[PDB]
Amino acid sequence: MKFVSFNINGLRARPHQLEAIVEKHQPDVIGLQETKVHDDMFPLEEVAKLGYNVFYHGQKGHYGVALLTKETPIAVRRGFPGDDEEAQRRIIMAEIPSLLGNVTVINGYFPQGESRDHPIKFPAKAQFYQNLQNYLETELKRDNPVLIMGDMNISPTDLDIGIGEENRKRWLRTGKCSFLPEEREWMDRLMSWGLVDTFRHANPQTADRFSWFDYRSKGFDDNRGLRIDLLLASQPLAECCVETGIDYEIRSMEKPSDHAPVWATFRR
Numbered sequence: 001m002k003f004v005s006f007n008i009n010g011l012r013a014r015p016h017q018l019e020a021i022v023e024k025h026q027p028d029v030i031g032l033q034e035t036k037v038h039d040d041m042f043p044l045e046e047v048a049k050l051g052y053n054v055f056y057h058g059q060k061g062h063y064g065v066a067l068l069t070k071e072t073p074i075a076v077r078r079g080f081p082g083d084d085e086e087a088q089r090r091i092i093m094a095e096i097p098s099l100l101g102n103v104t105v106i107n108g109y110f111p112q113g114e115s116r117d118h119p120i121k122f123p124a125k126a127q128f129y130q131n132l133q134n135y136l137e138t139e140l141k142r143d144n145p146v147l148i149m150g151d152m153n154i155s156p157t158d159l160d161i162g163i164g165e166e167n168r169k170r171w172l173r174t175g176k177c178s179f180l181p182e183e184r185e186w187m188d189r190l191m192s193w194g195l196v197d198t199f200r201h202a203n204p205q206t207a208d209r210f211s212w213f214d215y216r217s218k219g220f221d222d223n224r225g226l227r228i229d230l231l232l233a234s235q236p237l238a239e240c241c242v243e244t245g246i247d248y249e250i251r252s253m254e255k256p257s258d259h260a261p262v263w264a265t266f267r268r
Contacts, residue, residue, distance in 0.1 A: 001096075003147060003264050006032055007257060025263060033151045038058065051070065053073075065089065078091065080131055083131065110129070111125040113183070142234055159205075198244045211227045212259050247261045
């Protein structure tokens with residue numbers, strides 16, 4: 001079962017990248033973030049033509065998530081139970097069937113946060129992680145197959161930072177979000193529940209693979225980016241991970257999203 005996560009940054013502006021992912025990877029499940037399209041305008045026929053079932057929610061020009069699956073899910077919903085409207089445009093959760101059990105899949109577009117001192121965006125980010133943590137602890141078990149994917153907007157370790165030492169320190173000094181100590185705390189708490197960062201686990205010493213590169217600075221050319229798009233899997237799933245990757249080739253396409261698609265393949 002292959003999973004691909006991709007912050008497309010405008011689904012209707014980049015049908016070419018979505019088709020490329022399907023052709024190249026033939027994935028069983030695709031989680032999209034920042035689709036930026038209103039539900040009434042979602043490319044339902046186009047997605048159906050690609051051979052996928054799809055569940056989605058977003059609003060015009062902002063947020064938006066979609067979960068494309070080859071097989072039909074047992075259950076799917078937007079947001080965690082009790083979540084507000086905004087959270088519903090940032091999270092899709094599903095139970096995907098397999099012969100001997102179900103896999104819980106969570107696709108999220110986590111708040112960027114902007115800066116530690118932003119009176120609205122930073123609390124929103126903290127609360128988003130708190131809601132996820134609480135869902136995990138109250139409804140799931142570390143022994144269940146769970147896969148959390150998406151744009152986390154947090155670089156878990158320093159091996160995930162490629163913008164340069166001086167820039168790294170300036171960001172910390174000014175409180176710019178991505179790798180603040182508070183943010184790392186939320187991420188560590190999440191991992192401690194019993195999740196494995198698939199790419200990092202398969203590539204324990206790689207310090208030159210990133211998933212996001214800033215447009216304006218032309219970061220992709222110099223490989224100056226951050227690895228903030230992750231695929232976190234619980235124990236029983238992590239044990240079966242045979243391949244992981246970040247697709248630089250797709251990020252090399254014309255009119256590309258600033259994010260590279262990331263993937264993980266599970267096979268026993």
